[PDB]
Amino acid sequence: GADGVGNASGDWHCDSTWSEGHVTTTSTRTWVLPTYNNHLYKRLGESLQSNTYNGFSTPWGYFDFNRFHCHFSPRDWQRLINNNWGMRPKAMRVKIFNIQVKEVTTSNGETTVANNLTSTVQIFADSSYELPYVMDAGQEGSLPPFPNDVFMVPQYGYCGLVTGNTSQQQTDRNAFYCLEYFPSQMLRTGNNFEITYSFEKVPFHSMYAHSQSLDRLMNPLIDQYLWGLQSTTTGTTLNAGTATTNFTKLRPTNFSNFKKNWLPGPSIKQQGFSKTANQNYKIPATGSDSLIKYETHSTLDGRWSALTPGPPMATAGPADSKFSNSQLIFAGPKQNGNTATVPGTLIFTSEEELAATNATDTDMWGNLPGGDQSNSNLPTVDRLTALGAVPGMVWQNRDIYYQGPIWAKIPHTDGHFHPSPLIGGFGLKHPPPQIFIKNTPVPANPATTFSSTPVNSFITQYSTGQVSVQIDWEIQKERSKRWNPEVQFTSNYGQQNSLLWAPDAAGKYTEPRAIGTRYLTHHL
Amino acid sequence: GADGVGNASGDWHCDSTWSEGHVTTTSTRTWVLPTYNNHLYKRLGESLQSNTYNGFSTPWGYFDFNRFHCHFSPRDWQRLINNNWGMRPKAMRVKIFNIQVKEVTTSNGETTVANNLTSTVQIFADSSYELPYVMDAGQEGSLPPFPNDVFMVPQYGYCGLVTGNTSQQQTDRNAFYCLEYFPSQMLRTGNNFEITYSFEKVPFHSMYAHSQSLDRLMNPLIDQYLWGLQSTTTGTTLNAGTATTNFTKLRPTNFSNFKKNWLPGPSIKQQGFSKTANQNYKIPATGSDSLIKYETHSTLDGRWSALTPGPPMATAGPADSKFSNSQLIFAGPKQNGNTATVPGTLIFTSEEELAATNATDTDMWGNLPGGDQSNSNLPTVDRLTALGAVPGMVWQNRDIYYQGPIWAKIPHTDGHFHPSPLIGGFGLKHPPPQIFIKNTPVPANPATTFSSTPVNSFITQYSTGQVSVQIDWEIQKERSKRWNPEVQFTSNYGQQNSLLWAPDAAGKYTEPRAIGTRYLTHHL
Amino acid sequence: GADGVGNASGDWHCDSTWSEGHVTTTSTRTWVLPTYNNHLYKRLGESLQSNTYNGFSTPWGYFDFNRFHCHFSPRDWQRLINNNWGMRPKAMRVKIFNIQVKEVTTSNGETTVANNLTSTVQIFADSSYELPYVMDAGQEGSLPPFPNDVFMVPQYGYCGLVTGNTSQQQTDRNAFYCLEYFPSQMLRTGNNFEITYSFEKVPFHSMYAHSQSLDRLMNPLIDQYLWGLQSTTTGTTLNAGTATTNFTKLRPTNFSNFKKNWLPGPSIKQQGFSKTANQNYKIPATGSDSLIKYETHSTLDGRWSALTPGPPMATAGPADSKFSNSQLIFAGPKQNGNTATVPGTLIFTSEEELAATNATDTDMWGNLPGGDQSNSNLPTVDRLTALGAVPGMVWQNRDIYYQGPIWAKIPHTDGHFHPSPLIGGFGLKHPPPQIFIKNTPVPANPATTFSSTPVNSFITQYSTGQVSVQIDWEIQKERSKRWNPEVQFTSNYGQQNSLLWAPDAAGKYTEPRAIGTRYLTHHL
Ligand SMILES: Nc1ncnc2c1ncn2[C@H]1C[C@H](O)[C@@H](COP(=O)(O)O)O1
Ligand SMILES: Nc1ncnc2c1ncn2[C@H]1C[C@H](O)[C@@H](COP(=O)(O)O)O1
Ligand SMILES: Nc1ncnc2c1ncn2[C@H]1C[C@H](O)[C@@H](COP(=O)(O)O)O1
């Protein structure tokens, strides 16, 4: 990739091509790149007991396309989800171009901008995965959903290890990575970048809700050939009757005692809250009794971490007054602030579909006897609040969302367990590589006599250009023998003043709701 | 198409090549492209009871060549129409080039402009016809008739469906189209665009007036062998005579009772008005009794729409004091305003030629008895005001004008009827494609710290370049055995201070009159 | 097709195979055939003034598959309609088999049935179309929607011409057709029938609702270059002002006066009624003033015929209190009788979608002046109630329904107009052929001495067997650049006691609602 100054170095492609069981999304967006940290690396750190962290902020920016709406349009996502029991990324190709480097000159009063033709910009992809991976933390920076929205490239920054739960102080293990210590490609207008990636083979995402329920997978018309204890006494009253060993053949209408082959999957109880302000308990944000303490969390090296997405568990409804972590929440259309007090201002996700295989988040997994029953003792009935893997469990994973993550890098650790990103998406060992970009520094007028001191005065600059990502998605059509019509993502937003999923009168594009994927159905 | 900065990317071609029965018009014009809607899409809507509408306005512009004077010169149009009984578009080729992108900087006092070499402009043709077609609504935006007139590219905007006749409110059917969701070609100075199209096979336009009249297509020297009822009585006085059944052989001088094989085509009565202000009735513009109400109109979903061009019908004369819809009216040479009160300030079209086959607009189709005549009853003589298609009808279509439309897209509907654009022109299923163009957004100085908010600050820009359209027209020479000379479009504007059909002393080109096409003659 | 007694002569196939743009439905059903008209042809006739009719009833039965639900399942119809802008029949193959002939013997008290192995049954297809075509009259007899529902084969009967509007008396033109005067194929158990058909090339059915509205097909941002009369006076008051000729440039916000190229299609006013019993007028069924008289109807040879389906016209809503002919009405799920008084007991269809191109059924087409306006006269504003074809009209046709007709035979007449069955469906010149079937007569014990009198005593018999129809449907996927999600047929029947579109607890299958086809959208 290399030509002249007055020659576009690439074209605008915003395809959409469906077929058999392959769909290829292609999209381009214009971007802007500032001069981060005024050209330098800055060591980050701040002791915040549990929020304690340390690291570094770099002068580099980076492209992030880890959000579904970066590739599919509303209509597409609809297509995709109303006719396919699953999908998955297969291949990706990214390309940056039409680089334009600008140098600003703030006048006596206001700023004036001009084209620095010979100025260069750098790009390079960490395809060896030797740098903290940031594109999968569910953070901002991905491309805009709306094709014609210009966006700012995010600043690259990474965290180191926090030794302790007190100080951000760093050990001899903490490491510093320098992006200049990498081979980068230098570009000027007329040059361009391009790269290709191939997704690892990964399981198709569900994209369907279950019909049958795990506890009702038998023939309602027939007896088991298995027997069990029905009751130890004769009455209808606890601890009172002639006392006997009553065994049953386990036949229809019973079912809750039918011997079964599979159990619901692992769960960890979550605290449930109400959207109606006065049904909660009045826990504060800050303080020694901050919400954190009362919400189910994990503990790493003395530090707390909300069990946020957490294990795949059946959740509350999107409409239900109850909600909780485990439920993804996105900003509403009219919500533009770091804070809100009106539930109706936000968007609530829901894993209600999982109630066919997984346990409910706020409830429990089941119950255990708290001791050994006797003729002179009925044991306490304990609560199975958290339960790990056990032979015979099966479960569904969290759904995927139109404005959700697409993939996440699996942690470089010997051993794990069922690698599905908890925020959702595809867990890859080596995922789409992070592409870094940064404007090259331009020394301003220099001293006329030598100085071993590093340069300070730099011309002020910023760049802009387009970028396009093309991902090949493998999808699988359904083919069920279900007779009755299925549920489907439909418009149904009724009459409206300014069409939904479209810019308003002021020219602002905003996403009305969150869209799932599990509309279609498959049995167990 | 791709070369250097100091290298013209195309040349100026304003041909004219006649021959056998093929004529090729080629013309180029310089254009200017602004930054529409300040870069964004805006939802349009306004409840105006009957004028109610909704839609969107885009940041894109578009080339429109759907006007005859965009291609032929006065003299050409003359050539074309004085020797050919018909013509039609055959092929088209368009090309944009010499792109120049400029960035403005308004100084403390006044503006200053400079060349942004690396800035890009986008172009693309919706050749899949997947976008509201606008080029055929008889609106402004086509190229200037005068070769050396710079023009502004029109803003693309489209309307959605209006559900109701009250509110502009939109339903789940209304759709939003985004032009960035298309593959567009990016250009810089030195790049260029080009495309080719081939007109569908379509009937040659008339270009001739009829000699014979539909009701007089027999031999004036001979009797029919058919008989008919002449009169039911004996006198010369209605309802008075000896009463008898008088049949005739239907011979010469009669003719109005001759049995004929064809009837005049469909018509719908139109209200006629006078150019002399006090011969009308004093209907107001606005109000509950707006002109609309009193003028023949159609009704779609409770909304009114003037039956404007309407069915092909014989019209008043261009000089006659009477005029009406059904008659195309263009702005006069000295008329420069959205309004006028002096008929002589405007230009009146006329379908007077159709009086040989079609019914007259303001009159009626014919008459019917309002009941069954009897010896004790003479029925009311009813007025056949509107009549649809009936086996045996034949008719001529509206003429074509030098400054008229050339083609129009036939509506995507199962079924229609005789697809001739009512404003006139060629009805194509897939017509010359709409070519969209828009300047690419250029972020102004950006923030030094990341922000997930879409960019606002953009350098101010506008572009200019040339464009040329070449259309190959198939024409058919006459070959009549008519003996007497034919009528012809002649100059005859007598003496003049500043030659007509030429710029004036001030350098302004203005079109004197409207030119038809039906000067030559063919019989029936 | 011919084998043994203990050898199935065919298998059960109830496929469903989707693909590219071709879908093949295959379905089988079990049937029963009685002995119609006790073996003989009976001349039909009954003078009922306007309901007068004559004809013949035959001893033959016939297979009818002219209903969409005979082939697609709920889910299929859903698939089909949420992803395709159209479809059409391409090829068909039918086959009858597993013939079983039974002979009944009513005992002293009750009946006893036995297998008559050697008894034969006849089948034959009128593929020369030489017999009144009955399969397209929107009558009963088609196969059951539910695969496992046994059905009775319909009796074949046809009507002759009614000369007059008084007597059922027949002329020398009336004709009698005898099915025995055809080559039929005789079968016994072990034999079978089979046949293939290929649909004529026919336009794909719409399957989409329009976005844009016919009267709003321009760019809302630009002026026309055409001028028109705005008002004849100065005030805001009719017949009062300084009186002038006010012409306008016809620019935005106006639109109802914009010169347009196309008009709404033909229409004929229909009377509208209310579902709320006391908003009507109290017209009786029978009588000299029967509803017929007051409802728009046609008149053939003095006989009346409700203009029932009638012309494609925008209709009321399915929920609207107003309804009318022009709207297809089907029996509700709980409606089991020839009569009903509760609108909510039935199912109402709706062509509300056509309001983008067609005129509204109950309203009118538009308005005309009732005379010529003058300075001393403002003409009556007439109502354009019925309007036929007129150059420039365009329109959409009636939708298709899940339980609607599929095709209809075009009448054997020189000339017609836009052959789309008015009840809906595909108008074919030569449609799927009528397959006739009838049990062969079996003489009971006969006289021992000769008699030239035709046989009377026949063993009592009836037959049963399976039949399967396979139709290859050509469908076209969409491919719009619409951005916002589309409307879609979704379940949404909320919670329920007995799942919908599925048998109830009693084992009865009933269709909840009627399903259209126009969920997807295309512009104009
Ligand atoms: N997103 C994703 N990525 C990878 N694997 C997934 C994912 N979702 C479910 N699984 C399953 C597939 C295999 O059973 C498995 C292997 O983990 P391993 O430790 O590699 O033996 O985990
Ligand atoms: N401008 C134009 N375009 C197309 N057809 C025209 C036009 N003017 C007249 N006609 C006639 C030619 C055929 O008779 C016809 C077909 O309409 P169809 O519905 O395609 O059968 O309409
Ligand atoms: N269902 C159906 N069948 C056939 N034609 C249809 C149908 N629907 C619309 N049309 C249109 C297609 C052609 O324009 C036409 C020809 O009628 P013709 O009299 O054959 O010239 O009618």
DSSP assignments along B10-35, one per residue: S------B--SSEEEEEEEEEEEE--
Closest to C486 (Cα-Cα) out of C81, C30, C169, C141: C81
Residue of chain B with shortest Cα separation from A190: B118
How many domains, in total, are found in chain B? 1
- Other CB atoms closer than 10 Å to residue A505's CB: what's the count? 13
Token pair recorded at residue C250: 């016809």
Task: Tell me the C-alpha distance between A325 and A270, whole Å.
Answer: 7
Closest to B197 (Cα-Cα) out of B125, B256, B137, B265: B125
Residue nearest to atom 5 of ligand 2 (CA): B419
Q: Helical H runs in B309-440?
A: none
**A-chain residues near B40 (CB < 8 A):** 148, 503, 507
Pocket of ligand 1 (CB under 6 A): A 202-203, 416, 418-420, 426-427
Q: Which ligand is nearest to the CA of C408?
A: 3
**CB within 8 Å: C480 and A83:** no
* Angle (nearest 5°) at CA C172 between C166 and C175: 95
Chains in touch with C (3+ beta-carbon pairs under 8 Å) read A, B
Helix, strand or coil, per DSSP, at residue C455: coil
CATH number for the domain harbouring residue C483: 2.170.30.10
Chains in touch with B (3+ beta-carbon pairs under 8 Å) read A, C
Q: Which ligand is nearest to the CA of B414?
A: 3
In a 10 Å sphere around its CB, with 0-12 CB exposed, 13-18 middle and 19+ buried, how is residue A47 labelled? middle
Which one of A478, A491, A496, A504 makes the best mutation probe of the C interface by having the most chain C beta carbons within 10 Å? A491
> How far away, in angstroms, is A410 Cα from ligand 1 center?
10
Closest to B443 (Cα-Cα) out of A141, A152, A7, A12: A152
Task: Tell me the C-alpha distance between B297 and A405, whole Å.
Answer: 55
Task: Tell me the C-alpha distance between A306 and A291, whole Å.
Answer: 10
Least CB-CB distance to A151: which of B122, B178, B454?
Answer: B454
B28 forms beta bridges with B468
> How far away, in angstroms, is B418 Cα from ligand 2 center?
5
Q: Is C297 annotated as a binding residue?
A: no
Tokens 């690419």 locate to B440
Token pair recorded at residue A468: 């396009």
A520 forms beta bridges with A208
**CB within 8 Å: C394 and B385:** no
Task: Tell me the C-alpha distance between A126 and A430, whole Å.
Answer: 11
Q: Is C523 annotated as a binding residue?
A: no
Q: How many CB pairs under 8 A join B and C?
A: 400
Closest to A504 (Cα-Cα) out of A150, A146, A151, A152: A146
Say if CB B351 and CB B326 are below 8 A apart.
yes
Residues just before a chain gap in chain C (C–N exceeding 2.5 Å) are none
C154 lines ligand 3 (CB under 6 A): no
Q: Count how many Cα atoms sit within 13 Å of the Cα of residue C85 in the half-sphere of its side chain.
A: 13
C396 lines ligand 3 (CB under 6 A): no
Say if CB A162 and CB A44 are below 8 A apart.
no
Chain centroid to Cα B327, Å, comes to: 11
A186 forms beta bridges with A122
Closest to A158 (Cα-Cα) out of A60, A66, A64: A60
Q: Residues with Cβ < 8 Å from A300, sequence gap 6 or more? A: none
**CB within 8 Å: A10 and B56:** no
Closest to C65 (Cα-Cα) out of C513, C512, C467, C502: C467
Helices (H) and strands (E) in chain C, counts: 2, 30
Token pair recorded at residue B164: 């109701």
**C-chain residues near A26 (CB < 8 A):** none
CA of B426, closest atom in ligand 2: 1
Say if CB A217 and CB A24 are below 8 A apart.
no
CA–CA distances in Å: residue B54 to residues A280, A506, B46, B157, C251: 45, 14, 6, 11, 16
Token pair recorded at residue B380: 């009311």
Which one of A77, A486, A511, A520 makes the best mutation probe of the C interface by having the most chain C beta carbons within 10 Å? A486
**CB within 8 Å: B43 and A495:** no
Task: Tell me the C-alpha distance between A276 and A255, whole Å.
Answer: 37
In the PDB record, what is the listed experimental method? X-ray
**CB within 8 Å: B328 and C420:** no
Least CB-CB distance to A483: which of C75, C484, C486?
Answer: C75
Closest to B128 (Cα-Cα) out of A17, C219, C217, A83: A17
* Angle (nearest 5°) at CA A300 between A298 and A304: 55
Token pair recorded at residue C285: 């069924």
**CB within 8 Å: A491 and C484:** yes
Task: Tell me the C-alpha distance between C13 and C468, whole Å.
Answer: 7
Tokens 């500043």 locate to B498
**B-chain residues near C395 (CB < 8 A):** 413-416
B428 forms beta bridges with B409
B414 lines ligand 3 (CB under 6 A): yes
Q: Are strands A393-394 and A263-264 parallel, antiparallel or unpaired?
A: parallel
Least CB-CB distance to B298: which of C230, C366, C420?
Answer: C366
Identity (one letter) of the amino acid at B305? Answer: S
A519: closest CA of chain C, how far (Å) = 10
In eight-state DSSP terms, residue A392 is: T
Say if CB B422 and CB B325 are below 8 A apart.
no
Helix, strand or coil, per DSSP, at residue A310: coil
Write out the H or E segment, with its range, that includes residue A81. helix A74-82
Residue nearest to atom 6 of ligand 3 (CA): C419
Say if CB C68 and CB C400 are below 8 A apart.
yes
Say if CB A518 and CB A77 are below 8 A apart.
no
Q: Which ligand is nearest to the CA of B394?
A: 2
Q: Which residues of A are annotated as a binding site for Mg(2+)?
A: 69, 210, 412
C418 lines ligand 3 (CB under 6 A): yes
In eight-state DSSP terms, residue C81 is: H
Token pair recorded at residue A351: 């894993």
Identity (one letter) of the amino acid at C181? Answer: Y
**B-chain residues near C253 (CB < 8 A):** 46, 48, 51
Chains in touch with A (3+ beta-carbon pairs under 8 Å) read B, C
Q: Helical H runs in A212-363?
A: 291-294
Torsion of CA A492, A493, A498, A501, to 10 degrees: -80
Structural domain span for residue C65: 1-524
**CB within 8 Å: A36 and B448:** yes
**CB within 8 Å: C490 and A491:** no
Task: Tell me the C-alpha distance between A213 and C26, whole Å.
Answer: 32
Token pair recorded at residue A282: 């009045």
Q: Helical H runs in C391-481?
A: none
Task: Tell me the C-alpha distance between C307 and C422, whole Å.
Answer: 10
Which one of B3, B54, B111, B118 makes the best mutation probe of the A interface by having the most chain A beta carbons within 10 Å? B118
Closest to A328 (Cα-Cα) out of A481, A63, A138: A138
* Angle (nearest 5°) at CA C140 between C137 and C145: 120
Terminal-to-terminal C-alpha distance of chain B: 52
**CB within 8 Å: C501 and A484:** yes
> How far away, in angstroms, is C319 Cα from ligand 2 center?
39
Q: Residues with Cβ < 8 Å from C273, sequence gap 6 or more? A: C280, C322, C323, C324
**CB within 8 Å: C394 and B408:** no
Q: Which ligand is nearest to the CA of B423?
A: 2
Terminal-to-terminal C-alpha distance of chain A: 52
> How far away, in angstroms, is C419 Cα from ligand 3 center?
5
In eight-state DSSP terms, residue B9 is: S
> How far away, in angstroms, is A307 Cα from ligand 1 center?
21
Write out the H or E segment, with its range, that includes residue C61. strand C53-63
**CB within 8 Å: C502 and A489:** no
Task: Tell me the C-alpha distance between B482 and C137, whole Å.
Answer: 57
Which one of B52, B299, B358, B407 makes the best mutation probe of the C interface by having the most chain C beta carbons within 10 Å? B299
To test the pocket of ligand 3, the residue of C87, C202, C204, C395 to mutate (highest count of ligand atoms within 8 Å of its CB) is C202
Q: Residues with Cβ < 8 Å from C38, sequence gap 6 or more? A: C458
Residue of chain C with shortest Cα separation from B407: C261
- CA-based diameter of chain B, in Å? 109
Say if CB C88 and CB C203 are below 8 A apart.
yes
- Other CB atoms closer than 10 Å to residue A342's CB: what's the count? 11
Residue of chain A with shortest Cα separation from B168: A497
**CB within 8 Å: C75 and A18:** no
Its sign, for the CA torsion C211, C215, C218, C222, is: negative
Tokens 């029965």 locate to B21
Task: Tell me the C-alpha distance between C33 and C463, whole Å.
Answer: 5
Residue nearest to atom 20 of ligand 2 (CA): B419
Say if CB C105 and CB C513 are below 8 A apart.
no
Residue of chain B with shortest Cα separation from A148: B180
Total number of residues shown for chain A: 524
Task: Tell me the C-alpha distance between C365 and C343, whole Å.
Answer: 28
Task: Tell me the C-alpha distance between A17 and A471, whole Å.
Answer: 11
Residue of chain B with shortest Cα separation from A114: B116
In eight-state DSSP terms, residue B267 is: E
